[PDB]
Design a protein around this nucleic acid. Structure first.
Lengths: 227, 240
DNA sequence: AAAGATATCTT
DNA sequence: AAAGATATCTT
């Protein structure tokens, strides 16, 4: 399938100029996120093409998702792929905001949310370890990571019940080992529960203390009649 | 000076080079996307070696943050004069056409400027200057990988990079650059005004005072000040 | 944990 | 404009 294929298809050491000069990579996530993103684009486009899918990136810069795949024939069977990165020296990711397109069908999203039948997360985890180089020195350039693991999984399967960020209201993923994301050992019973829980999550602790702050509390809140 | 050398070095390097991809230790090159999150990572990468070459030529040691979320990108100083540090942050923004106005986000106004030790590599009071290297690019196949034998084949996602170096306080504006992340917004103007230094604050003390007292929301800024004129009046009356 | 800091963009 | 979106991190 498009899925098993992308998963099968999934060492960068620097940026290069049209004149051959090579600049080394930085050690932070802001840098590795960008790298992994560009590393993945050709892979995604290769596999999508194989399967007759069109790949589309956002024109407005703060729109979800990173990649939108679909066959011009079936407009409502669109797929969303977002690339997430974190490091190790148990990992956790920030999975997008919870007050946007999930609460509002067209808010900050390339196509209306209801046209997307799948929402995949390609996750990269890297283990953390000032001179330009020339093409002939490629093998001596120090890399800013010891290793790199990648996985493809459904967003709902890996989402957790605690916020990933405060002021930028992001969904937190489960806090677990790499295996668990690969295997999909989540906390939510279905994609419907995942969506309901985040559509009703309050922004601050004081506002959540009267509703719920975790999955057990949300279930007891469903019982009380959503009041 | 360190300043004039650095500006010439950046300016020169930018005229002569053109970043077109990321490369693997095995020689495969991946193309660049055309969104600022990417181009700003690239520009910071392109800048590091130059910044270090010039600082070395003047006796300055260069340090990068140990944690993500600590200002600035680069701390320069002499081992003999520790308490005279220089802060440099790289900022990026794009334009849809050359000449049109631009503006940058310049960091929070609720962190180190308000709390001398919050989110900064060294206590705020050890820096004698805060510089900004700004990159402006015009937004503009790129889905396949290339080999070294095709470096000049790979298309670029930008039309005309411009770079400038200027003091933060000089280019800072009076309206916030962001809401939830409480950023200082720069002046909104033409690239020349950034180069020339056509700002709004009279001094670096004014800039810091305006930003140390700027309220987080319109509602609270009603009874205070929402712009430079109002700040001056506020000041005139005794900050009441 | 929860909250807020490093980061630009819309509209 | 202001406010709040796409980025992960730290305490």
């Amino acid at each position: 399938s498009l899925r098993s294929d992308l998963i099968n298809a999934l060492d960068v050491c620097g940026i290069i100029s049209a004149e051959g000069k090579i600049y080394p990579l930085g050690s932070d996530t802001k840098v590795l996120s960008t790298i992994f993103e560009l590393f993945s684009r050709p892979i995604i486009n290769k596999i999508a093409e194989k399967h007759g899918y069109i790949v589309e990136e956002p024109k407005q810069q703060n729109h979800y998702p990173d990649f939108t795949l679909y066959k011009p024939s079936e407009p409502n069977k669109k797929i969303a792929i977002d690339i997430k990165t974190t490091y190790t020296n148990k990992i956790k990711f920030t999975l997008g905001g919870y007050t946007s397109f999930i609460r509002n069908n067209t808010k900050n999203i390339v196509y209306p949310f209801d046209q997307y039948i799948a929402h995949w997360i390609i996750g990269y985890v890297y283990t953390r370890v000032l001179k330009t180089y020339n093409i002939n020195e490629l093998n001596e350039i120090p890399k800013p990571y010891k290793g790199v693991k990648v996985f493809l999984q459904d967003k709902w399967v890996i989402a957790g019940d605690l916020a990933g960020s405060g002021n930028t209201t992001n969904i937190g993923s489960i806090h677990a080992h790499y295996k668990d994301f690969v295997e999909g050992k989540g906390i939510f019973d279905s994609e419907d529960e995942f969506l309901d829980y985040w559509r009703n999550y309050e922004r601050t602790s004081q506002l959540r203390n009267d509703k719920y702050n975790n999955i057990s509390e949300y279930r007891n809140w469903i019982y009380r009649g959503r009041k």
